[PDB]
Design an enzyme around this catalytic site. Structure first.
Site, PDB file in Angstrom:
ATOM      1  N   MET A  12      43.838  43.976  46.986  1.00  0.00           N
ATOM      2  CA  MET A  12      43.791  43.700  45.686  1.00  0.00           C
ATOM      3  C   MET A  12      45.110  44.158  45.165  1.00  0.00           C
ATOM      4  O   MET A  12      45.336  45.353  44.288  1.00  0.00           O
ATOM      5  CB  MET A  12      42.754  44.532  45.005  1.00  0.00           C
ATOM      6  CG  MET A  12      41.529  43.853  44.511  1.00  0.00           C
ATOM      7  SD  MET A  12      39.864  45.279  44.198  1.00  0.00           S
ATOM      8  CE  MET A  12      40.834  46.355  43.320  1.00  0.00           C
ATOM      9  N   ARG A  13      45.745  44.023  45.931  1.00  0.00           N
ATOM     10  CA  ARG A  13      47.064  43.790  45.964  1.00  0.00           C
ATOM     11  C   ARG A  13      47.946  43.419  44.867  1.00  0.00           C
ATOM     12  O   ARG A  13      48.714  43.347  43.879  1.00  0.00           O
ATOM     13  CB  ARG A  13      48.500  44.214  46.885  1.00  0.00           C
ATOM     14  CG  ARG A  13      49.688  44.588  46.455  1.00  0.00           C
ATOM     15  CD  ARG A  13      50.548  44.924  47.816  1.00  0.00           C
ATOM     16  NE  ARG A  13      52.224  45.402  47.358  1.00  0.00           N
ATOM     17  CZ  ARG A  13      53.171  44.961  47.261  1.00  0.00           C
ATOM     18  NH1 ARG A  13      53.301  43.380  47.130  1.00  0.00           N
ATOM     19  NH2 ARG A  13      54.113  45.422  46.842  1.00  0.00           N
ATOM     20  N   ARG A  14      47.847  41.599  45.309  1.00  0.00           N
ATOM     21  CA  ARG A  14      48.664  40.964  44.675  1.00  0.00           C
ATOM     22  C   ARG A  14      47.360  39.402  44.045  1.00  0.00           C
ATOM     23  O   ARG A  14      46.389  38.997  45.386  1.00  0.00           O
ATOM     24  CB  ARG A  14      49.261  40.276  45.125  1.00  0.00           C
ATOM     25  CG  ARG A  14      50.427  40.821  45.199  1.00  0.00           C
ATOM     26  CD  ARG A  14      51.876  40.726  43.674  1.00  0.00           C
ATOM     27  NE  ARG A  14      52.500  42.110  44.517  1.00  0.00           N
ATOM     28  CZ  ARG A  14      53.062  43.653  43.964  1.00  0.00           C
ATOM     29  NH1 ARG A  14      51.235  44.259  43.736  1.00  0.00           N
ATOM     30  NH2 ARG A  14      53.967  44.164  44.294  1.00  0.00           N
TER      31      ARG A  14
END
Ligand SMILES: [Fe+3]
Ligand SMILES: [Fe+3]
Ligand SMILES: [Fe+3]
Lengths: 264, 264, 264
Positions: free
Chosen positions: A72-74
């Protein structure tokens, strides 16, 4: 007075309301922010094209913008999420990329601008200077739909769209959890623990939670790994550090992976 | 025999019961401690004035002794908590400060004293010596009213007051959870993982939990950040370290923030 | 196609199915593995003697093979667990030790062998070379009977025995959770985040969970603390690192204690 206040960023930048702002930062650590370049219009355009993607993107299209580790960073994460930062982004299309780059830039600009005002109102010069501090490692997370926590950011900016009128977000204010509904015209700012740290304890990092009975855009303004602070000063305002020595970096404190929230 | 034993600190200091004590430390890692300077009388006085505060302090009084980050390290946290250590404390009044400084000092003295006996019974000389090891970073947490965990302290001392006679605290002993009720005359000691570590695996750190169907005073005796130990020895007694090299510090192991408990 | 594929290790070692394998690694990050030296026969023998221990070992026998800290790293943990690695093991008897050393060796050999094929198919040469990378810090955990997570291993090998026919293990595949039942003849391999990292994002680390309506043997192939990687490359495939500088070690990233799993 347990009202969540509202400040115009423009007015703050003109030197107005400085005692009110300082008291808000110390006593509450949250406020709505108007006149910061962040409009329901612009949210609407980014929100529509990402919902279109969540609704109607094939899974092949989704996989192309899915990171190989589910952090869920990019990119896309399946309640569905879309995440971005200043580089290494994953975009579903040319039109999407134009819209979301613009949206991200406005959120980053607003976040740096209110952080600059938090630092100025508290007399704070970060080690290494203000602009190196604010040229940092932000994260934007868009969610399409808790245990209470505080954020570990400098500041967090939150845009929401309302429910068909349930209010999911609540924060502690004057020792009670208080509704934080959408405001057309305003972004919600939560101070995080890094504001507390950098300012020597002049800023509260309020506890908050997302209740189940919508969408949320959350922008975390997060320091660089090499952000350096005084260890004894960290100890004075409640940080239970296990740090040898007189100074430390954010990496020293939090470790090798960003940690965005913490519970009591 | 799954009895939780009781030791007189005075008797231990006189060289009595050394084989019993060593076997307790190895096989159980918990015991009640009498004759250690910690009385129901003294608890009573600290407990009364903090309950008075929790009950009858205005919120303005509470905010003055609230840290800006909600870490439960110092001051008031709203079940309600009051926390202290050796410095940087937040006290509601002159009378409170006198009482709680005294109470903290007696708990710190008792904790160092039983830790000294744990080290002596196990033949342990910490790297850097006993007294630098014990001159450390304690935390006292008072609660006014779990998933099972072990403590990461050297030792933890626990005073309780009873319920109107439900027994909330339970610990694993001989492979069953066993009640640990209040004792008028005694403090409950749990060995933590740092006892296991420093002694080369001669001390158990027992799992325990607080059950819902009171007050608790919990004193964590926690090492300094620079506490140094042997990495291969840590590996021999069950620590799943990811540490390069032959020696490491507590900071190396746990990170930049104290961590007081851990689950399996 | 959301089928979980099966590969023969022998065939992979002969250079067959390389495009299929690479696509599996990128798109799914899980597969069954046959012809790897891991038989239901051998599982059966290790499983029988550990169940015999769990069922019929006195508690004195259990305590002798219990670590003083309850980390589930070595020995017995009471659903019951038995854990091992390459050294510092705790064994209930001569017969047990023979059987479990052999079983561990076969699992370690199979895990290194499939990791070697993951690296070869992706063109990957770890900093410091392949064989120093694979001579690492594995952990074997046997359980006798979740929130979804991914593993932080290089690879994880999973043998199971079936229920009296409920299927507990599920993994995300093509955006749905899919059953992963026992296979007589095959071991289940999950790629972990270290595969993603070392290969520069060419390998997915799939989310998975163990559902409640059996036994499981889980072998984690975990890198050494000094495993070194490129920080900007870590950032390119979704790792939200807070690492200053151009290179980092596994210890830098994860800290001083192994962490085997992570949630979103
Ligand atoms: Fe938050
Ligand atoms: Fe505890
Ligand atoms: Fe797993």
């Amino acid at each position: 007075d347990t009202t969540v206040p509202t400040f115009s960023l423009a007015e703050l930048q003109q030197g107005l309301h400085q005692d009110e702002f300082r008291r808000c930062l110390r006593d509450k650590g949250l406020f709505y922010l108007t006149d910061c370049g962040l409009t329901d219009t612009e949210l609407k355009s980014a929100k529509d094209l990402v919902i279109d993607f969540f609704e109607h993107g094939s899974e092949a299209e989704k996989r192309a913008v899915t990171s190989p580790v589910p952090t869920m960073r990019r990119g896309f994460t399946g309640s569905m999420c879309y995440s971005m930062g200043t580089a290494d982004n994953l975009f579903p299309s040319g039109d999407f990329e134009r819209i979301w780059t613009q949206y991200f830039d406005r959120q980053y600009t607003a976040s740096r601008a209110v952080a600059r005002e938090v630092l100025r109102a508290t007399g704070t010069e970060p080690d290494g200077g203000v602009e190196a501090f604010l040229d940092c490692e932000p994260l934007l997370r868009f969610r399409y739909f808790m245990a209470p926590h505080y954020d570990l950011s400098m500041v967090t900016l939150i845009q929401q769209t309302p429910c068909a009128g349930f209010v999911s977000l609540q924060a502690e204010v004057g020792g009670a959890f208080t509704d934080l509904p959408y405001r057309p015209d305003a972004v919600l700012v939560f101070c995080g623990a890094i504001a507390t740290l950098v300012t020597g304890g002049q800023v509260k990092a309020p506890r908050h939670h997302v209740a189940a009975p919508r969408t949320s855009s959350v922008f975390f303004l997060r320091p660089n790994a090499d952000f350096t602070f005084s260890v004894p000063l960290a100890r004075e305002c409640g940080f239970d550090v296990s740090l040898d020595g007189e100074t430390a970096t954010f990496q020293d404190w939090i470790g090798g992976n960003y940690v965005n929230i913490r519970r009591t």
